[PDB]
Amino acid sequence: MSQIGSSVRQAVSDNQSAQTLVEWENSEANPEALFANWRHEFMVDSSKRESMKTELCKELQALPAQDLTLFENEIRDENNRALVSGCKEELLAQVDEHFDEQRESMSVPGHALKAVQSRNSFRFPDNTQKRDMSNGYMAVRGDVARKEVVLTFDDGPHGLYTDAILRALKEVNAKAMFFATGKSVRTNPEALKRVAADGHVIGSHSITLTFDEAAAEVRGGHQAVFDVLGWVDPVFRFPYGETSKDLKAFLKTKSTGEFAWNIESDDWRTQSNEQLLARVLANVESQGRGIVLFHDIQRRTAEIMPQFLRELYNRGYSVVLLTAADPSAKYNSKLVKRK
Ligand SMILES: [Mg+2]
Ligand SMILES: [Zn+2]
């Protein structure tokens, strides 16, 4: 199996050795990238298909279940159906059994795959705060008060996990900001509509360039949201670590807020549910307030969301939604083409 096995082991290794999100973003063995390349190889040489399948299955089946979670989204992705058809059910049983075991030790269990009403029976107060985005806006902590946090979710919607996150938020009257990506929106428009219907803010996150190529990436995610909903909030998040002064100026000209964050979840890193809750809550406490970075495409984030929300409440934190001061801004984005 050596090249496929080497790449599988490399994904796991790089995920553990990365010190930051940006470093992990720099990996050459990101599972999404690995499977995009395998789909291409599979397409272009039919003589290699059966051996790719047997090898991929053997190498993924060799992983400990917790490590296998790194590849879960690729295994679930119907685009990869032919690659994993030989072992999909078995792999997903291993991952599902892992999250079953993880759930046992939680006082407020969640479930990313099915609709569960958690044990949460509290309600965060409404707390929506307006920001003038007409000549842009740079958010790090978002100008919120002590013990206020803004929950933000990148790269969705996912076909399953986002709805679990929505259920968790709704149960406790929490609102959030979603920075959707074009690819996810095109795959899952009905899920995006459910996010919209639950009162959340929805902007975009680009994913990869010359200035014009980068600007086109900024427009494209915004356009995808707009094409589904008839609006897109004037909020945008760069590809992590982007420093371009030109793109920052562009956003201001285009009356769109630029959202960074100050509270890391590290939810990109394979880890136990326990570890993830500990890291994100330690960072909430360390910072005291601000903007939290989650990914609604990360299963484990959906699994821990009810528990996370209960701990925010227990710890005296309140959830804030940031939104444009101009309620019409979402219908008149300078990043989208009408009609
Ligand atoms: Mg505004
Ligand atoms: Zn992202």
Residue numbers in the entry: 23 to 230, 249 to 379
Authors' description from the paper:
We identified two related genes (bd0468 and bd3279) in the B. bacteriovorus HD100 genome whose products had homology to one domain of the peptidoglycan deacetylase PgdA of Streptococcus pneumoniae. Here we show that both genes are expressed early in predation and act upon the GlcNAc residues of the prey cell to modify the prey peptidoglycan structure. In contrast to early ideas of solely stabilising prey peptidoglycan; the modification caused by the Bd0468 and Bd3279 GlcNAc deacetylases targets the prey bdelloplast peptidoglycan for destruction at the end of the predatory cycle, and without it a “ghost” of prey- bacterial peptidoglycan and some membrane remains after Bdellovibrio predation.
We obtained a high-resolution structure of the secreted, mature form of Bd3279 (encompassing amino acids 24–383) at 1.5 Å resolution. Bd3279 is comprised of two domains, an N-terminal domain (NTD, amino acids 24–126) and the catalytic C-terminal domain (CTD, amino acids 127–383). The NTD forms a compact structure comprised of seven regular and two 310 α-helices, stabilized by a disulphide bond between residues Cys79 and Cys109. This domain approximately resembles a “cap” over the active site of the enzyme, and has no precedent in existing peptidoglycan deacetylase protein structures; indeed, the sequence of this region appears to be unique to Bdellovibrio and its close relatives. One of the active site loops of Bd3279 is at least partially disordered, with weak electron density for amino acids 229/230 and no interpretable electron density for region 231–248. The CE-4 ×2+ catalytic ion binding pocket is present in Bd3279, co-ordinated by residues His227 and Asp177; the third superfamily-conserved ion liganding residue would be expected to be contributed by His231, which is present in the disordered active site loop and thus not modelled in our structure. In-line with homologous CE-4 domains, we have modelled the ion as Zn2+, putatively arising from co-purification as no exogenous zinc was added at any stage. Unique to Bd3279, the NTD sits over these active site motifs, with residues Leu43, Val44, Trp46 and Glu47 projecting into the substrate-binding cleft; such proximity may regulate enzyme activity. In total, the structure of Bd3279 confirms that deacetylase activity is likely to be attributable to the same conserved machinery of other, previously characterized CE-4 enzymes, but with unique flanking features (obscuring of substrate binding cleft by novel N-terminal domain “plugging”; extension of active site by disordered loop) that currently appear to be predator-specific. Domain closure appears to have affected the position of two active site motifs, given that His231 and Tyr280 are in orientations incompatible with catalysis, yet we observe activity with the purified protein.
